Structure 1
Amino acid sequence: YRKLGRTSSQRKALLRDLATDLIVHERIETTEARAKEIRKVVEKLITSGKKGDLHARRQAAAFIRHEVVEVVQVKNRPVYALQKLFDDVAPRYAERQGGYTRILKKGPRRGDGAPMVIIELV
């Protein structure tokens, strides 16, 4: 694996933020070397959704953050990120084995010349 210019504590807290945004928004904007590391932690997190066990749900719940993706007017029931992963994103890839993400290069950033990419969930 690769470090990302930050200590061990801040690296884990960064991979959990990025992996959750890709679940919620399905399309994000990161640097090239930073998008080649959340590629691994997201596909390993869809796999826990293709099992559906309580054991797998409790294991993935230790990595997903806790924010409301959107409010559903059932009586109002906010929907959380873990519910989206296990009820929507996981059933979509019931037939594909691997590679639930694609990475598309964009070009350098103005401020610091960093190479930006698009990483999608398809």
Structure 2
Amino acid sequence: ISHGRVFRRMGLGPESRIHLLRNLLTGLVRHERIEAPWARVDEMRGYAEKLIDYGKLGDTNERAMRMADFWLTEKDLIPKLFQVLAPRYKDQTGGYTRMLQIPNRSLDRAKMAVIEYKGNCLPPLPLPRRDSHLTLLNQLLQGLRQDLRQSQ
């Protein structure tokens, strides 16, 4: 029975789970785009958002500095976290990460996903785009909208 359990059981235990997520998140902070098993990316997305929030908190915040020191195993990324990512997202309030499924791993056919920080310098992902507004159905719905607006 796992009603309400929100954390996956990963690695060799709770500590190993935290360390795996920490390594994935350090890689994400360094490269701004990381491909990894789908479940691990899903688990680490929340921690990535939380680091962005802690970076928003600021350098002077000792709690934020301690959190960054723990979570970024490569200490050169803490200045990055506090001076490149948080300033980038200062305007935003959330949704700093884009996660998209990827064709299964060639080795073990594992469900993989790519997670990136939005606005990175890397080439854009082939994002799935909704159907154009000029399609038949979309044009009919536009006619509906125009008729309703004219009525009101």
Q: Taking structure 2 as the reference length, what is the TM-score of the superposition?
A: 0.68
Aligned to 2:20: 14
Aligned to 1:44: 50
The one-letter amino acid paired with 1:61 is D
Quick one: distance in 1 between partners of 2:74 and 2:110?
30
Matches within 5 A, 1:1-122: 1-52=7-58, 53-55=60-62, 56-67=64-75, 80-122=76-118
The one-letter amino acid paired with 2:71 is F
Residue 5 of structure 1, CA deviation: 4.5
Count of equivalent residues? 110
Cα shift readout 1:35-65 (whole Å, capped 9, x = no counterpart): 1011011110110111113322233212211
Quick one: distance in 1 between partners of 2:67 and 2:104?
37
Quick one: distance in 2 between partners of 1:12 and 1:96?
27
Q: 1:96 to 1:16 in 2, by over 3 A?
A: same
Which structure has greater strand proportion? 1
Residue 113 of structure 1, CA deviation: 1.1
| 3-state SS in 2 of match to 1:97 | coil
Q: Taking structure 1 as the reference length, what is the TM-score of the superposition?
A: 0.83
Quick one: distance in 2 between partners of 1:13 and 1:105?
23
The one-letter amino acid paired with 1:65 is T
Q: CA RMSD in A?
A: 1.3
Quick one: distance in 2 between partners of 1:60 and 1:31?
24
Greater displacement, 105-114 / 31-40: 105-114
Runs of 4+ residues deviating >3 angstroms: none
Report which of the two structures shows the higher radius of gyration computed on alpha carbons: 2
Quick one: distance in 1 between partners of 2:86 and 2:49?
10
Percent identity, aligned pairs only? Answer: 43
Quick one: distance in 1 between partners of 2:113 and 2:50?
21
Which structure has greater helix proportion? 2
